[PDB]
Amino acid sequence: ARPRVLTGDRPTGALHLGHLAGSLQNRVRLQDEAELFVLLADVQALTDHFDRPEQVRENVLAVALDYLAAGLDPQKTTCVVQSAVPELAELTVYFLNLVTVSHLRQNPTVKAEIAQKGYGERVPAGFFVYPVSQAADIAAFGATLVPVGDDQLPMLEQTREIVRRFNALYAPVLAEPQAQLSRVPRLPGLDGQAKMSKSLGNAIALGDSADEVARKVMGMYTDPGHLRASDPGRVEGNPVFTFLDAFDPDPARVQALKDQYRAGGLGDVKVKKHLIDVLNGVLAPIRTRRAEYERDPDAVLRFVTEGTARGREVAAQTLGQVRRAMRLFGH
Amino acid sequence: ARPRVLTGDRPTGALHLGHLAGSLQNRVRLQDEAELFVLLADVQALTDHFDRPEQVRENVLAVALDYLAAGLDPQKTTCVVQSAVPELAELTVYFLNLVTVSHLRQNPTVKAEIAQKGYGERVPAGFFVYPVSQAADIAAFGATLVPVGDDQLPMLEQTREIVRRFNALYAPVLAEPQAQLSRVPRLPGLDGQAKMSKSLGNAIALGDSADEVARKVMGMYTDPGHLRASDPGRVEGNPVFTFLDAFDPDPARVQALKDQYRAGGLGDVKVKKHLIDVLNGVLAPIRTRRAEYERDPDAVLRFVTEGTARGREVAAQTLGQVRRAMRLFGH
Numbered sequence A, B: 001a002r003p004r005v006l007t008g009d010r011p012t013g014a015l016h017l018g019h020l021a022g023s024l025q026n027r028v029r030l031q032d033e034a035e036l037f038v039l040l041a042d043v044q045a046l047t048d049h050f051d052r053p054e055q056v057r058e059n060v061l062a063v064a065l066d067y068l069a070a071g072l073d074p075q076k077t078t079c080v081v082q083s084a085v086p087e088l089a090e091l092t093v094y095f096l097n098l099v100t101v102s103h104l105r106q107n108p109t110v111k112a113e114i115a116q117k118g119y120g121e122r123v124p125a126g127f128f129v130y131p132v133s134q135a136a137d138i139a140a141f142g143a144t145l146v147p148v149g150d151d152q153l154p155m156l157e158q159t160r161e162i163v164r165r166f167n168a169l170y171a172p173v174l175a176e177p178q179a180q181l182s183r184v185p186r187l188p189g190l191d192g193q194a195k196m197s198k199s200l201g202n203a204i205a206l207g208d209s210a211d212e213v214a215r216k217v218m219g220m221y222t223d224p225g226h227l228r229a230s231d232p233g234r235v236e237g238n239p240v241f242t243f244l245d246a247f248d249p250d251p252a253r254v255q256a257l258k259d260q261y262r263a264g265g266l267g268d269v270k271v272k273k274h275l276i277d278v279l280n281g282v283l284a285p286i287r288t289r290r291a292e293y294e295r296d297p298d299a300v301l302r303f304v305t306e307g308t309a310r311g312r313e314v315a316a317q318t319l320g321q322v323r324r325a326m327r328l329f330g331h
């Protein structure tokens, strides 16, 4: 617990295996060697789900359950609800003056999201400026370390430019955050697509039963040109093997399987059955905790209402120095 | 009283003659005909003076002074410092999700301000976004009536739209404000321009001495082509006549000079000399009232502090409604 680390998820659905490999495992490690803050960004979730406020509200507790199921320790990690800390909103408006529409339009990750969203020019204001509200999140909690995939770096770098702009303009009162680069490639979906997502219908939820997990793995995309076991098959592009590199505890088995698969005679069945065994080993403890916490709804609520109290107090302090530094009337 | 009315100014310096005919005397009278709220747009002032925070801080008290000297009574008007009502920033963020960047791009007023400031695509986000920040000001205070210059209509109309969209998506807890059009269009500068402002240096501040007011009138743009008295003059484009038209109580008397001046025996000096006194007359009491308060600074502070508390009270009430209407986790 030395550097304060900030991470988070906009609450829009249940977490899945992609989040586990992409951010959860690394977060369970961080809680023991840093002070970890996780933001349930329901406000940010609203920049594009403003038409589905029920969906957002219900997922705040569902993702919290997922964090805990994942292994995030209520006595180690501060879980906070963005909605319950208005200090963030207050800070993002001040931050809006430190950035240009021009530079906001150049952000490559938002540009790509809008592209995939098909918005066109009909981009909702809140979404267009969300990178700043995130900057507000980082500075307010006073995080100095932010886990990031290269897809979020422009979010992070802008944060850096903003804090830098704020300190030089008013007074050097905000910490400059540093990135904790990557998590190695993103977990592809069950049918082989680049992205794993509920929406795309190719995911395995952390909450999926051991049976379901087995079924989902069975119908996984493999190798279009591999038609029967005797045939040789390709590893690259084949998610069954991409899943194995991200969860299989022993690469010896992994590399061995890869061998015999390019050879021939090793059907998808024997490989997949082995995937099932490795996934059930990573997931079983996550399923037990999740079921346990289900019996203890009060324990999950305590997890968030308390992280929130802490988060509120921290953000409140920062705004105090921000207000004074900005020379705001009465400070 | 009856309706709630929201009016305000961006604290950037002393108020002048344009605010007077522009609204100050208007609110002086709607001050007992309704519940009048006057917002010192502290934050909105930063989307333009984010690099000169000191300038803003200093003018909150100076404009409040201006307010009081203009005739506003502490017992009937709620003076509110924007920055001290964080609830407004909270509501602004939520409103941002209700409008598109392309819609903000077609606001004629902001577009003109932007071209004048030479920002180009390098427009500060906070500024490009100020119209909705204003809609939040309106919606948070429950304002049903908003006096508006011909010029501020786009903004007023965007407010109703957003309020409307907010009510349909979430719940009908916000009121659509209605406009109060004025007669005297934007009082022009001494310059002969369309705008009077301390920035353009063509303004007669409410604090200027009988000597100054007289000196400013004498250097006031009139009519080229009219070189000597004798000659015939014309009222179109002459700030002095559009000054008499907004500050002179005897229209029969005005339309009088309008005759003679088109003929040729009314020297611009004579027009001026008259008008200068019609201004000292409208200004005389304002000057004495200012001295009183200038000698009771404690009272100006009071006006601001008490009002700001009252207004936050009001904002807090509406936000509670908004927060529950949006189904934000926990409400």
Ligand SMILES: N[C@@H](Cc1c[nH]c2ccccc12)C(=O)O
Pocket: A006, A007, A008, A009, A010, A039, A041, A044, A134, A137, A138, A146, A152, A155
């Ligand atoms: N996926 C979200 C996660 C998030 C929300 N707010 C944050 C603040 C800091 C770090 C991450 C976040 C994002 O793109 O940002």
